[PDB]
Amino acid sequence: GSHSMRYFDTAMSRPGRGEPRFISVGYVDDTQFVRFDSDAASPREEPYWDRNTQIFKTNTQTDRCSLRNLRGYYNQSEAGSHTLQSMYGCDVGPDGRLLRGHNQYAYDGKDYIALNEDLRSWTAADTAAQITQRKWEAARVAEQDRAYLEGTCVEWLRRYLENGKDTLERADPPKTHVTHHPISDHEATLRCWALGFYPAEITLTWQRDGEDQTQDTELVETRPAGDRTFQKWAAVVVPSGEEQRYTCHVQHEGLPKPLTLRWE
């Protein structure tokens, strides 16, 4: 299948409680491979070292610079706490070739600036992000980001995938069952379960007489089990007696074929 390497970085100011906390977490697909936390007694955690640690430390200082500049760009007081988030990295296909790169930011939960798919130009959300844009154009930042995303990112992802092929390239199918719970004399809940799967991407739906029931299905967010795998369920309320009109459909990369399940 296709794979991604992505960093999810958070920097959070906290006036009166020290310098902003920086945390960076790196993933291959849905597997964390590195963490750096500026508040850690022991910075970096892991499931040359030197050079990577230095980049995380410098990134801490860079995100603090960013937070200071952003406060000014929005005329904000020094009293409040603010959040800067970053996503960066690369997606490859089954052959290892670059599908696309990513380098983007959000401020206080709102998209701020992103490197376009061309890896050459920027999209700025507002007049503040236009300042960042002009700054980055003047310094030819996109070129540096492009070089990382097309070179180092893709090369490291390919090496990690190969070295970790027994886990990172293994899709574990869901274990599935349907449960049944009366809610009244007239109606019952059917709940379709998917347990033990990896990666997290899954589709779980109910149909009635072969028609999708999007509006009447309760679908919980996919959730981690803590052993690398994920869980999800989907529930529908059905009239008593009509249970066999309902089918649960399951698609996942680890299945040899899609599943159609019914109560018992």
Partner: peptide, 10 residues
Amino acid sequence: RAFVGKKYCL
């Protein structure tokens, strides 16, 4: 060589 990306100040 490094696997972590260098960032730039906004």
